[PDB]
């Protein structure tokens, strides 16, 4: 049964950049679901959902302070979660 072998990590990123949230599955499986709080994310201009084998990646583009908070990744019954902190640009 597929598990998150490597959990999501808490990150701190500057405003305006791109945040890359990464985790790893115990085998190559799909599809995974990404969430911000309890909201399931849709691939679009804001979020890019990427997969490279067992490596999973969420790109949060055009980072604003409102994009900060808890993100999660889920597959079947398994979940992993971390927080994104956004730091204001000088």
Partnered with residue 82 across adjacent β-strands are 71
Interatomic CA distance for residues 84 and 67, integer angstroms: 8
- DSSP label of 57: E
Tally Cβ neighbours within 10 Å of residue 62.
Answer: 12
Helix, strand or coil, per DSSP, at residue 56: strand
What does the chain come to in residues? 90
Which residues constitute the domain of residue 28? Answer: 1-89
Q: CATH number, domain at 38?
A: 2.60.40.10
**Tally of domains within the chain:** 1
Q: What is the dihedral of CA 20, 3, 37, 63, to 10 degrees?
A: 0
- Residue 89, φ and ψ in degrees, nearest 5: -80, 135
- Resolution attained, angstroms: 2.0
> Minimal CA–CA distance to 54: which of 22, 25, 21?
25
Residues 29 and 75 sit within 8 Å (Cβ to Cβ)? yes
Kindly give the residue spans of alpha helices, DSSP state H, lying in the chain. Answer: none
């Amino acid at each position: 049964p597929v598990r998150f072998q490597e959990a999501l990590k808490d990150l701190e990123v500057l405003e305006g950049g791109a945040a890359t949230l990464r985790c790893v599955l115990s085998s190559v499986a799909a599809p995974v679901k990404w969430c911000y709080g309890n909201n399931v994310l849709r691939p679009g201009d804001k979020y890019s959902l990427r997969q490279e084998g067992a490596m999973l990646e969420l790109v949060v583009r055009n980072l604003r302070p409102q994009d900060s908070g808890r993100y999660s990744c889920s597959f079947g019954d398994q979940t992993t979660s971390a927080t994104l902190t956004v730091t204001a640009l000088p």
